[PDB]
Design a protein around this ligand. Sequence first.
Ligand SMILES: Nc1nc2c(ncn2[C@@H]2O[C@H](COP(=O)(O)OP(=O)(O)NP(=O)(O)O)[C@@H](O)[C@H]2O)c(=O)[nH]1
Ligand SMILES: Nc1nc2c(ncn2[C@@H]2O[C@H](COP(=O)(O)OP(=O)(O)NP(=O)(O)O)[C@@H](O)[C@H]2O)c(=O)[nH]1
Ligand SMILES: [Mg+2]
Ligand SMILES: [Mg+2]
Lengths: 243, 252
Amino acid sequence: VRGWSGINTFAPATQTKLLELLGNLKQEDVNSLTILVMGKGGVGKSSTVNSIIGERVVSISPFQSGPRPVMVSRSRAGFTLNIIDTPGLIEGGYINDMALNIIKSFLLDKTIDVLLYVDRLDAYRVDNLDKLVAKAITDSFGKGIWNKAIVALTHAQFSPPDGLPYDEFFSKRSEALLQVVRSGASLASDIPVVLIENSGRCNSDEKVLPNGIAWIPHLVQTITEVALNKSESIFVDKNLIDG
Amino acid sequence: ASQQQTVRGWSGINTFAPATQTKLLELLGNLKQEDVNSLTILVMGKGGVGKSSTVNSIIGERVVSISPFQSEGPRPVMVSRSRAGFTLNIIDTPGLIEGGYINDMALNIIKSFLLDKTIDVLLYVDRLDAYRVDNLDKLVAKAITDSFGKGIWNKAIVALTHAQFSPPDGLPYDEFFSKRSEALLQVVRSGASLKSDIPVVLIENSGRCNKNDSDEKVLPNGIAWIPHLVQTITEVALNKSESIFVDKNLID
Ligand SMILES: Nc1nc2c(ncn2[C@@H]2O[C@H](COP(=O)(O)OP(=O)(O)NP(=O)(O)O)[C@@H](O)[C@H]2O)c(=O)[nH]1
Ligand SMILES: Nc1nc2c(ncn2[C@@H]2O[C@H](COP(=O)(O)OP(=O)(O)NP(=O)(O)O)[C@@H](O)[C@H]2O)c(=O)[nH]1
Ligand SMILES: [Mg+2]
Ligand SMILES: [Mg+2]
Protein backbone atom coordinates (compact mmCIF):
# COMPACT_ATOMS: atom_id res chain seq x y z
CA VAL A 1 0.00 0.00 0.00
CA ARG A 2 2.80 2.51 0.98
CA GLY A 3 5.70 1.66 -1.43
CA TRP A 4 8.51 -0.73 -0.36
CA SER A 5 11.27 1.85 -0.14
CA GLY A 6 13.09 -0.46 2.27
CA ILE A 7 14.48 -2.75 -0.41
CA ASN A 8 16.62 0.15 -1.62
CA THR A 9 18.56 -0.27 1.64
CA PHE A 10 19.49 -3.85 0.80
CA ALA A 11 22.54 -4.94 -1.14
CA PRO A 12 22.33 -5.02 -4.93
CA ALA A 13 22.89 -8.81 -4.92
CA THR A 14 19.95 -8.97 -2.40
CA GLN A 15 17.95 -6.38 -4.37
CA THR A 16 18.44 -8.42 -7.57
CA LYS A 17 17.39 -11.65 -5.80
CA LEU A 18 14.24 -10.20 -4.17
CA LEU A 19 13.09 -8.70 -7.47
CA GLU A 20 13.70 -12.15 -9.07
CA LEU A 21 11.98 -13.91 -6.13
CA LEU A 22 9.07 -11.49 -6.29
CA GLY A 23 9.13 -12.09 -10.06
CA ASN A 24 8.27 -15.79 -9.87
CA LEU A 25 5.42 -15.17 -7.39
CA LYS A 26 4.11 -12.67 -9.97
CA GLN A 27 4.62 -15.44 -12.60
CA GLU A 28 2.17 -17.64 -10.63
CA ASP A 29 -0.53 -15.02 -10.10
CA VAL A 30 0.73 -14.45 -6.57
CA ASN A 31 0.40 -10.69 -6.01
CA SER A 32 -0.33 -10.25 -2.35
CA LEU A 33 1.23 -12.39 0.39
CA THR A 34 0.37 -11.98 4.04
CA ILE A 35 2.86 -13.09 6.70
CA LEU A 36 2.00 -13.46 10.34
CA VAL A 37 4.83 -13.11 12.80
CA MET A 38 4.17 -14.77 16.15
CA GLY A 39 6.09 -16.00 19.11
CA LYS A 40 7.26 -15.36 22.53
CA GLY A 41 8.72 -12.67 22.83
CA GLY A 42 11.51 -10.35 23.29
CA VAL A 43 12.80 -12.90 20.78
CA GLY A 44 13.05 -10.52 17.81
CA LYS A 45 9.68 -10.35 16.15
CA SER A 46 9.54 -6.68 15.60
CA SER A 47 13.18 -6.62 14.64
CA THR A 48 12.52 -9.31 12.06
CA VAL A 49 9.61 -7.36 10.69
CA ASN A 50 11.95 -4.40 10.51
CA SER A 51 14.69 -6.30 8.70
CA ILE A 52 12.27 -7.64 6.15
CA ILE A 53 10.63 -4.24 5.42
CA GLY A 54 14.15 -2.72 5.19
CA GLU A 55 13.32 0.03 7.71
CA ARG A 56 12.21 0.72 11.32
CA VAL A 57 8.55 0.23 11.01
CA VAL A 58 7.82 -1.26 14.38
CA SER A 59 8.96 -0.29 17.82
CA ILE A 60 11.70 -2.37 19.35
CA SER A 61 12.03 -2.00 23.14
CA PRO A 62 15.29 -3.44 24.35
CA PHE A 63 13.85 -3.75 27.95
CA GLN A 64 10.05 -4.36 28.16
CA SER A 65 7.39 -5.22 25.55
CA GLY A 66 3.00 -3.95 24.15
CA PRO A 67 -0.24 -5.31 22.91
CA ARG A 68 -0.41 -3.63 19.46
CA PRO A 69 -0.54 -5.89 16.55
CA VAL A 70 0.34 -4.12 13.38
CA MET A 71 0.23 -4.92 9.75
CA VAL A 72 2.62 -3.05 7.57
CA SER A 73 2.23 -3.14 3.83
CA ARG A 74 4.66 -2.42 1.09
CA SER A 75 4.18 -2.64 -2.66
CA ARG A 76 6.81 -3.30 -5.37
CA ALA A 77 6.82 -4.54 -8.99
CA GLY A 78 3.04 -4.89 -8.55
CA PHE A 79 3.51 -7.33 -5.67
CA THR A 80 2.21 -6.40 -2.14
CA LEU A 81 3.71 -7.65 1.11
CA ASN A 82 1.71 -7.51 4.30
CA ILE A 83 3.61 -8.32 7.51
CA ILE A 84 1.77 -8.65 10.82
CA ASP A 85 3.82 -7.98 13.98
CA THR A 86 2.03 -9.34 17.07
CA PRO A 87 2.57 -9.28 20.85
CA GLY A 88 4.51 -12.01 22.57
CA LEU A 89 2.07 -14.70 23.54
CA ILE A 90 3.46 -15.56 26.99
CA GLU A 91 3.12 -13.81 30.36
CA GLY A 92 4.97 -15.15 33.35
CA GLY A 93 4.37 -18.85 32.81
CA TYR A 94 1.01 -18.68 31.03
CA ILE A 95 -0.39 -17.57 27.68
CA ASN A 96 -1.72 -14.02 27.66
CA ASP A 97 -5.25 -14.76 26.61
CA MET A 98 -6.26 -11.17 26.09
CA ALA A 99 -3.28 -10.71 23.75
CA LEU A 100 -4.03 -13.88 21.77
CA ASN A 101 -7.72 -12.86 21.38
CA ILE A 102 -6.60 -9.51 20.01
CA ILE A 103 -4.28 -11.12 17.39
CA LYS A 104 -7.24 -13.32 16.46
CA SER A 105 -9.80 -10.58 16.25
CA PHE A 106 -7.32 -8.39 14.25
CA LEU A 107 -6.91 -11.30 11.77
CA LEU A 108 -10.69 -11.67 11.40
CA ASP A 109 -11.16 -11.92 7.65
CA LYS A 110 -7.42 -11.72 6.71
CA THR A 111 -5.50 -14.60 5.03
CA ILE A 112 -2.36 -16.10 6.53
CA ASP A 113 -0.12 -17.08 3.63
CA VAL A 114 3.00 -17.79 5.70
CA LEU A 115 3.33 -17.92 9.51
CA LEU A 116 6.77 -16.90 10.82
CA TYR A 117 7.28 -18.45 14.27
CA VAL A 118 10.18 -16.63 15.86
CA ASP A 119 12.53 -17.70 18.63
CA ARG A 120 16.17 -17.11 19.60
CA LEU A 121 18.95 -19.31 18.22
CA ASP A 122 21.04 -18.71 21.36
CA ALA A 123 18.74 -20.19 23.99
CA TYR A 124 19.68 -23.36 25.77
CA ARG A 125 16.17 -24.81 26.48
CA VAL A 126 12.74 -25.86 25.39
CA ASP A 127 9.85 -26.47 27.86
CA ASN A 128 6.16 -26.06 28.48
CA LEU A 129 6.37 -22.41 27.53
CA ASP A 130 7.41 -23.24 24.01
CA LYS A 131 4.67 -26.00 24.03
CA LEU A 132 1.90 -23.57 25.09
CA VAL A 133 2.69 -21.17 22.22
CA ALA A 134 2.46 -23.99 19.57
CA LYS A 135 -0.74 -24.93 21.38
CA ALA A 136 -2.14 -21.37 21.16
CA ILE A 137 -1.29 -21.13 17.43
CA THR A 138 -3.00 -24.45 16.59
CA ASP A 139 -6.21 -23.66 18.59
CA SER A 140 -6.53 -20.25 17.04
CA PHE A 141 -5.79 -21.13 13.35
CA GLY A 142 -5.77 -24.92 12.99
CA LYS A 143 -3.13 -27.56 12.41
CA GLY A 144 -3.37 -26.59 8.70
CA ILE A 145 -1.32 -23.44 9.44
CA TRP A 146 1.85 -25.48 10.13
CA ASN A 147 2.07 -26.42 6.45
CA LYS A 148 2.50 -22.66 5.74
CA ALA A 149 4.87 -22.23 8.74
CA ILE A 150 8.60 -21.39 8.93
CA VAL A 151 10.64 -21.21 12.17
CA ALA A 152 13.10 -18.30 12.31
CA LEU A 153 15.91 -18.29 14.82
CA THR A 154 17.29 -14.81 15.56
CA HIS A 155 20.66 -13.85 17.11
CA ALA A 156 22.13 -16.10 14.39
CA GLN A 157 25.49 -14.33 14.67
CA PHE A 158 26.07 -16.54 17.64
CA SER A 159 29.18 -18.50 18.23
CA PRO A 160 28.25 -21.48 20.42
CA PRO A 161 29.55 -22.36 23.89
CA ASP A 162 32.18 -24.95 24.86
CA GLY A 163 33.56 -25.26 21.37
CA LEU A 164 30.38 -26.83 20.00
CA PRO A 165 30.68 -26.17 16.29
CA TYR A 166 28.01 -23.82 14.91
CA ASP A 167 26.09 -26.52 13.03
CA GLU A 168 25.94 -29.08 15.80
CA PHE A 169 24.63 -26.40 18.15
CA PHE A 170 22.18 -25.27 15.49
CA SER A 171 21.16 -28.73 14.56
CA LYS A 172 20.44 -29.78 18.16
CA ARG A 173 18.39 -26.65 18.94
CA SER A 174 16.35 -26.98 15.74
CA GLU A 175 15.18 -30.46 16.72
CA ALA A 176 14.71 -29.43 20.37
CA LEU A 177 12.25 -26.77 19.24
CA LEU A 178 10.75 -28.57 16.28
CA GLN A 179 9.94 -31.52 18.62
CA VAL A 180 8.13 -29.31 21.17
CA VAL A 181 6.21 -27.14 18.69
CA ARG A 182 5.22 -30.41 16.94
CA SER A 183 4.11 -31.55 20.39
CA GLY A 184 2.07 -28.47 21.33
CA ALA A 185 0.50 -28.36 17.87
CA SER A 186 0.03 -32.17 17.89
CA LEU A 187 1.84 -33.50 14.75
CA ALA A 188 5.49 -34.03 8.99
CA SER A 189 5.80 -32.23 6.69
CA ASP A 190 8.54 -29.75 6.20
CA ILE A 191 8.84 -27.65 8.31
CA PRO A 192 11.57 -25.15 7.55
CA VAL A 193 14.03 -23.50 9.91
CA VAL A 194 15.83 -20.31 8.66
CA LEU A 195 18.36 -18.19 10.55
CA ILE A 196 18.16 -14.45 11.19
CA GLU A 197 20.57 -11.66 12.25
CA ASN A 198 18.65 -8.43 12.95
CA SER A 199 21.94 -7.37 14.43
CA GLY A 200 22.14 -5.21 12.32
CA ARG A 201 25.34 -6.35 10.42
CA CYS A 202 26.95 -8.92 9.95
CA ASN A 203 29.56 -10.58 7.77
CA SER A 204 29.13 -9.94 -1.52
CA ASP A 205 27.38 -7.77 -0.61
CA GLU A 206 24.47 -8.65 1.73
CA LYS A 207 24.88 -10.26 4.96
CA VAL A 208 26.00 -13.86 5.58
CA LEU A 209 25.65 -16.15 8.68
CA PRO A 210 28.57 -18.18 10.17
CA ASN A 211 27.71 -21.11 7.89
CA GLY A 212 28.02 -19.24 4.53
CA ILE A 213 24.31 -18.52 3.83
CA ALA A 214 22.92 -15.05 2.89
CA TRP A 215 19.76 -15.08 4.99
CA ILE A 216 17.53 -12.27 3.56
CA PRO A 217 17.51 -13.91 0.16
CA HIS A 218 17.21 -17.26 1.99
CA LEU A 219 14.16 -16.17 4.03
CA VAL A 220 12.24 -14.56 1.10
CA GLN A 221 13.15 -17.70 -0.85
CA THR A 222 11.77 -19.91 1.92
CA ILE A 223 8.74 -17.56 2.09
CA THR A 224 8.20 -18.08 -1.67
CA GLU A 225 8.62 -21.89 -1.42
CA VAL A 226 6.21 -22.14 1.52
CA ALA A 227 3.92 -19.67 -0.32
CA LEU A 228 3.81 -21.94 -3.44
CA ASN A 229 3.54 -25.48 -1.83
CA LYS A 230 -0.33 -25.44 -2.11
CA SER A 231 -1.31 -25.31 0.59
CA GLU A 232 -3.83 -23.72 1.10
CA SER A 233 -3.56 -20.36 2.83
CA ILE A 234 -5.75 -19.89 5.98
CA PHE A 235 -8.80 -17.63 5.85
CA VAL A 236 -9.34 -16.50 9.44
CA ASP A 237 -13.16 -16.59 9.82
CA LYS A 238 -15.22 -15.87 12.89
CA ASN A 239 -15.59 -19.68 12.67
CA LEU A 240 -12.01 -20.57 13.46
CA ILE A 241 -11.56 -18.54 16.59
CA ASP A 242 -14.07 -20.37 18.78
CA GLY A 243 -12.08 -23.56 18.06
CA ALA B 1 59.07 -30.11 65.05
CA SER B 2 57.07 -30.94 61.96
CA GLN B 3 53.83 -32.67 60.93
CA GLN B 4 52.23 -33.88 57.74
CA GLN B 5 49.06 -31.84 57.79
CA THR B 6 46.40 -32.85 55.34
CA VAL B 7 44.37 -30.26 53.46
CA ARG B 8 42.08 -29.95 50.55
CA GLY B 9 42.93 -27.27 48.50
CA TRP B 10 42.99 -25.29 45.44
CA SER B 11 45.03 -26.36 42.44
CA GLY B 12 42.49 -24.37 40.43
CA ILE B 13 43.98 -20.97 41.42
CA ASN B 14 47.29 -21.80 39.81
CA THR B 15 45.49 -21.84 36.46
CA PHE B 16 44.51 -18.15 36.64
CA ALA B 17 46.59 -15.41 35.12
CA PRO B 18 49.41 -14.45 37.56
CA ALA B 19 48.07 -10.92 37.99
CA THR B 20 44.72 -12.41 39.00
CA GLN B 21 46.08 -14.99 41.50
CA THR B 22 47.94 -12.21 43.19
CA LYS B 23 44.74 -10.27 43.74
CA LEU B 24 42.93 -13.36 44.91
CA LEU B 25 45.69 -14.39 47.32
CA GLU B 26 45.42 -10.81 48.69
CA LEU B 27 41.69 -11.01 49.18
CA LEU B 28 41.95 -14.31 51.01
CA GLY B 29 44.31 -12.59 53.46
CA ASN B 30 41.82 -9.77 53.88
CA LEU B 31 39.34 -12.50 54.90
CA LYS B 32 41.73 -14.41 57.19
CA GLN B 33 42.65 -11.04 58.54
CA GLU B 34 39.18 -10.39 59.93
CA ASP B 35 38.99 -13.99 61.24
CA VAL B 36 36.93 -15.18 58.29
CA ASN B 37 38.33 -18.72 57.96
CA SER B 38 35.78 -20.14 55.57
CA LEU B 39 33.06 -18.91 53.23
CA THR B 40 30.08 -20.87 51.98
CA ILE B 41 28.72 -19.42 48.73
CA LEU B 42 25.25 -20.60 47.62
CA VAL B 43 24.63 -20.23 43.88
CA MET B 44 21.03 -19.97 42.79
CA GLY B 45 19.08 -18.93 39.69
CA LYS B 46 16.76 -19.70 36.82
CA GLY B 47 17.87 -22.64 34.78
CA GLY B 48 20.31 -22.29 31.89
CA VAL B 49 21.88 -19.04 33.09
CA GLY B 50 25.44 -20.29 33.87
CA LYS B 51 25.29 -21.21 37.57
CA SER B 52 27.53 -24.24 36.89
CA SER B 53 29.89 -22.42 34.51
CA THR B 54 30.46 -19.67 37.09
CA VAL B 55 31.20 -22.20 39.84
CA ASN B 56 33.69 -23.81 37.43
CA SER B 57 35.17 -20.38 36.72
CA ILE B 58 35.61 -19.33 40.37
CA ILE B 59 37.12 -22.64 41.40
CA GLY B 60 39.13 -22.62 38.15
CA GLU B 61 38.50 -26.38 37.54
CA ARG B 62 35.66 -28.32 35.82
CA VAL B 63 34.01 -29.56 38.95
CA VAL B 64 30.37 -29.12 37.94
CA SER B 65 28.74 -30.15 34.72
CA ILE B 66 27.62 -27.92 31.91
CA SER B 67 24.31 -27.91 30.10
CA PRO B 68 23.84 -26.18 26.70
CA PHE B 69 20.52 -27.94 26.01
CA GLN B 70 19.71 -30.04 28.74
CA SER B 71 19.28 -29.43 32.53
CA GLU B 72 20.20 -32.30 33.45
CA GLY B 73 21.34 -32.51 37.07
CA PRO B 74 18.65 -32.01 39.77
CA ARG B 75 20.77 -32.17 42.99
CA PRO B 76 23.19 -29.66 44.53
CA VAL B 77 26.86 -30.16 44.19
CA MET B 78 29.08 -28.56 46.81
CA VAL B 79 32.72 -27.90 45.81
CA SER B 80 35.17 -27.21 48.61
CA ARG B 81 38.77 -26.07 48.44
CA SER B 82 41.45 -24.57 50.60
CA ARG B 83 44.50 -22.36 50.72
CA ALA B 84 46.64 -20.99 53.54
CA GLY B 85 44.06 -21.78 56.27
CA PHE B 86 41.03 -20.53 54.32
CA THR B 87 38.29 -22.90 53.08
CA LEU B 88 36.05 -21.94 50.18
CA ASN B 89 32.79 -23.90 49.83
CA ILE B 90 30.62 -23.15 46.87
CA ILE B 91 27.17 -24.82 46.36
CA ASP B 92 25.99 -25.15 42.73
CA THR B 93 22.19 -25.68 42.51
CA PRO B 94 19.56 -26.59 39.89
CA GLY B 95 17.60 -23.81 38.17
CA LEU B 96 14.57 -23.03 40.33
CA ILE B 97 12.21 -22.20 37.43
CA GLU B 98 10.72 -24.89 35.17
CA GLY B 99 8.29 -24.21 32.38
CA GLY B 100 6.04 -21.54 33.80
CA TYR B 101 6.46 -22.37 37.47
CA ILE B 102 8.91 -22.80 40.37
CA ASN B 103 10.22 -26.25 40.79
CA ASP B 104 9.64 -27.19 44.42
CA MET B 105 11.28 -30.61 44.07
CA ALA B 106 14.39 -28.79 42.93
CA LEU B 107 13.79 -26.16 45.63
CA ASN B 108 13.07 -28.59 48.43
CA ILE B 109 16.29 -30.54 48.04
CA ILE B 110 18.24 -27.29 47.95
CA LYS B 111 16.53 -26.46 51.28
CA SER B 112 17.07 -29.88 52.78
CA PHE B 113 20.68 -29.92 51.58
CA LEU B 114 21.50 -26.61 53.33
CA LEU B 115 20.28 -27.66 56.81
CA ASP B 116 22.91 -26.84 59.43
CA LYS B 117 25.14 -25.17 56.82
CA THR B 118 25.53 -21.41 56.93
CA ILE B 119 25.15 -19.14 53.88
CA ASP B 120 27.78 -16.43 53.82
CA VAL B 121 27.02 -15.24 50.32
CA LEU B 122 24.22 -15.85 47.82
CA LEU B 123 25.27 -15.62 44.19
CA TYR B 124 22.01 -14.97 42.30
CA VAL B 125 22.81 -15.81 38.68
CA ASP B 126 21.18 -14.56 35.46
CA ARG B 127 22.04 -13.60 31.86
CA LEU B 128 23.11 -10.15 30.84
CA ASP B 129 21.69 -10.57 27.36
CA ALA B 130 18.08 -11.13 28.28
CA TYR B 131 15.78 -8.27 27.27
CA ARG B 132 12.79 -8.89 29.48
CA VAL B 133 11.89 -9.31 33.10
CA ASP B 134 8.69 -10.72 34.37
CA ASN B 135 7.09 -12.55 37.21
CA LEU B 136 9.13 -15.74 36.65
CA ASP B 137 12.09 -13.74 37.92
CA LYS B 138 10.02 -12.38 40.77
CA LEU B 139 8.82 -15.91 41.63
CA VAL B 140 12.50 -16.80 41.93
CA ALA B 141 13.21 -13.92 44.31
CA LYS B 142 10.16 -14.83 46.33
CA ALA B 143 11.11 -18.49 46.51
CA ILE B 144 14.53 -17.53 47.86
CA THR B 145 13.07 -15.12 50.47
CA ASP B 146 10.49 -17.64 51.53
CA SER B 147 13.15 -20.26 51.92
CA PHE B 148 15.80 -18.22 53.76
CA GLY B 149 14.46 -14.83 55.01
CA LYS B 150 14.69 -11.19 53.83
CA GLY B 151 18.12 -11.39 55.48
CA ILE B 152 19.72 -13.48 52.79
CA TRP B 153 19.56 -10.36 50.54
CA ASN B 154 21.99 -8.55 52.84
CA LYS B 155 24.41 -11.23 51.51
CA ALA B 156 23.19 -11.17 47.88
CA ILE B 157 25.32 -10.50 44.86
CA VAL B 158 23.54 -10.50 41.46
CA ALA B 159 25.90 -11.84 38.72
CA LEU B 160 24.98 -11.39 35.04
CA THR B 161 26.70 -13.84 32.71
CA HIS B 162 27.63 -13.68 29.02
CA ALA B 163 29.18 -10.28 29.80
CA GLN B 164 31.07 -10.29 26.48
CA PHE B 165 28.12 -8.72 24.69
CA SER B 166 27.80 -5.90 22.22
CA PRO B 167 24.36 -4.40 22.94
CA PRO B 168 22.04 -3.90 19.97
CA ASP B 169 21.28 -0.66 18.21
CA GLY B 170 24.53 0.91 19.31
CA LEU B 171 23.38 1.29 22.88
CA PRO B 172 26.56 1.66 24.85
CA TYR B 173 27.63 -1.31 27.02
CA ASP B 174 27.37 0.54 30.35
CA GLU B 175 24.03 2.00 29.51
CA PHE B 176 22.67 -1.48 28.71
CA PHE B 177 24.26 -2.88 31.84
CA SER B 178 22.64 -0.26 33.91
CA LYS B 179 19.09 -0.65 32.56
CA ARG B 180 19.34 -4.52 32.80
CA SER B 181 20.57 -4.16 36.43
CA GLU B 182 17.92 -1.58 37.38
CA ALA B 183 15.15 -3.72 35.84
CA LEU B 184 16.28 -6.93 37.63
CA LEU B 185 17.01 -5.43 41.05
CA GLN B 186 13.52 -3.89 40.83
CA VAL B 187 11.90 -7.26 40.34
CA VAL B 188 14.11 -9.16 42.77
CA ARG B 189 13.17 -6.55 45.37
CA SER B 190 9.53 -6.86 44.46
CA GLY B 191 9.40 -10.67 44.76
CA ALA B 192 11.81 -10.41 47.66
CA SER B 193 9.36 -7.99 49.33
CA LEU B 194 12.18 -5.56 50.21
CA LYS B 195 12.16 -1.95 49.03
CA SER B 196 21.62 -1.63 49.11
CA ASP B 197 23.63 -3.78 48.70
CA ILE B 198 22.85 -5.44 46.22
CA PRO B 199 25.93 -5.47 44.16
CA VAL B 200 25.75 -6.40 40.49
CA VAL B 201 28.82 -7.92 38.87
CA LEU B 202 29.36 -9.18 35.35
CA ILE B 203 30.66 -12.58 34.31
CA GLU B 204 31.92 -14.02 31.08
CA ASN B 205 32.71 -17.65 31.40
CA SER B 206 33.87 -18.24 27.84
CA GLY B 207 37.30 -19.52 26.85
CA ARG B 208 37.28 -16.84 24.16
CA CYS B 209 36.83 -13.98 26.63
CA ASN B 210 38.99 -10.93 25.96
CA LYS B 211 42.12 -10.42 28.05
CA ASN B 212 43.95 -7.34 29.30
CA ASP B 213 47.75 -7.04 28.87
CA SER B 214 48.24 -9.23 32.01
CA ASP B 215 46.24 -12.05 30.48
CA GLU B 216 43.32 -11.55 32.78
CA LYS B 217 39.88 -12.03 31.44
CA VAL B 218 38.40 -8.51 30.89
CA LEU B 219 34.93 -7.19 30.36
CA PRO B 220 34.33 -4.79 27.48
CA ASN B 221 34.14 -2.15 30.25
CA GLY B 222 37.82 -2.75 31.06
CA ILE B 223 37.37 -4.63 34.39
CA ALA B 224 39.06 -7.95 35.27
CA TRP B 225 35.94 -9.83 36.14
CA ILE B 226 37.28 -12.64 38.36
CA PRO B 227 39.14 -10.46 40.85
CA HIS B 228 36.28 -8.00 40.81
CA LEU B 229 33.89 -10.73 41.63
CA VAL B 230 36.11 -12.24 44.36
CA GLN B 231 36.42 -8.71 45.69
CA THR B 232 32.69 -8.08 45.78
CA ILE B 233 32.37 -11.44 47.61
CA THR B 234 34.84 -10.13 50.12
CA GLU B 235 33.12 -6.88 50.75
CA VAL B 236 29.87 -8.69 51.30
CA ALA B 237 31.54 -11.42 53.42
CA LEU B 238 32.79 -8.56 55.55
CA ASN B 239 29.74 -6.30 55.55
CA LYS B 240 27.99 -5.97 58.85
CA SER B 241 25.04 -8.36 58.35
CA GLU B 242 24.67 -11.84 59.82
CA SER B 243 25.31 -14.87 57.69
CA ILE B 244 22.23 -17.07 57.50
CA PHE B 245 22.00 -20.26 59.54
CA VAL B 246 19.72 -22.99 58.12
CA ASP B 247 17.58 -24.38 60.96
CA LYS B 248 14.40 -26.36 60.49
CA ASN B 249 12.61 -23.18 61.56
CA LEU B 250 14.06 -21.23 58.60
CA ILE B 251 13.22 -23.77 55.93
CA ASP B 252 9.63 -24.63 57.17
N1 LIG C 1 21.83 -9.40 18.41
C1 LIG C 1 20.53 -9.45 18.10
N2 LIG C 1 19.64 -8.78 18.86
C2 LIG C 1 18.38 -8.95 18.39
C3 LIG C 1 17.98 -9.68 17.32
N3 LIG C 1 16.61 -9.61 17.15
C4 LIG C 1 16.23 -8.84 18.13
N4 LIG C 1 17.26 -8.40 18.92
C5 LIG C 1 17.20 -7.53 20.07
O1 LIG C 1 16.38 -8.08 21.09
C6 LIG C 1 15.50 -7.08 21.66
C7 LIG C 1 14.08 -7.48 21.34
O2 LIG C 1 13.74 -7.33 19.92
P1 LIG C 1 12.23 -7.13 19.50
O3 LIG C 1 12.10 -7.08 17.98
O4 LIG C 1 11.69 -5.99 20.32
O5 LIG C 1 11.61 -8.53 20.03
P2 LIG C 1 10.01 -8.80 20.19
O6 LIG C 1 9.88 -10.27 20.14
O7 LIG C 1 9.31 -8.00 19.12
N5 LIG C 1 9.69 -8.18 21.70
P3 LIG C 1 8.08 -8.00 22.12
O8 LIG C 1 7.51 -9.34 21.90
O9 LIG C 1 7.99 -7.66 23.58
O10 LIG C 1 7.39 -7.00 21.16
C8 LIG C 1 15.99 -5.77 21.06
O11 LIG C 1 17.04 -5.20 21.90
C9 LIG C 1 16.55 -6.20 19.75
O12 LIG C 1 17.59 -5.38 19.31
C10 LIG C 1 18.93 -10.39 16.53
O13 LIG C 1 18.78 -11.07 15.53
N6 LIG C 1 20.21 -10.21 17.01
N1 LIG D 1 29.19 -17.40 26.18
C1 LIG D 1 28.86 -17.81 27.42
N2 LIG D 1 28.21 -18.94 27.61
C2 LIG D 1 28.01 -19.17 28.92
C3 LIG D 1 28.32 -18.42 30.01
N3 LIG D 1 27.93 -19.00 31.21
C4 LIG D 1 27.35 -20.10 30.80
N4 LIG D 1 27.38 -20.27 29.43
C5 LIG D 1 26.83 -21.35 28.65
O1 LIG D 1 25.47 -21.41 29.01
C6 LIG D 1 25.07 -22.80 29.08
C7 LIG D 1 24.57 -22.95 30.48
O2 LIG D 1 25.66 -23.11 31.39
P1 LIG D 1 25.33 -23.82 32.73
O3 LIG D 1 26.55 -23.54 33.55
O4 LIG D 1 24.83 -25.19 32.54
O5 LIG D 1 24.05 -22.97 33.25
P2 LIG D 1 23.26 -23.42 34.58
O6 LIG D 1 22.84 -22.13 35.15
O7 LIG D 1 24.20 -24.20 35.45
N5 LIG D 1 22.07 -24.38 33.98
P3 LIG D 1 21.20 -25.49 34.94
O8 LIG D 1 20.15 -24.75 35.68
O9 LIG D 1 20.66 -26.47 33.94
O10 LIG D 1 22.20 -26.27 35.79
C8 LIG D 1 26.29 -23.63 28.70
O11 LIG D 1 26.28 -23.84 27.29
C9 LIG D 1 27.46 -22.74 28.92
O12 LIG D 1 28.50 -22.99 28.00
C10 LIG D 1 28.99 -17.19 29.82
O13 LIG D 1 29.38 -16.34 30.65
N6 LIG D 1 29.22 -17.00 28.44
MG1 LIG E 1 7.85 -6.59 19.23
MG1 LIG F 1 24.11 -26.05 36.30
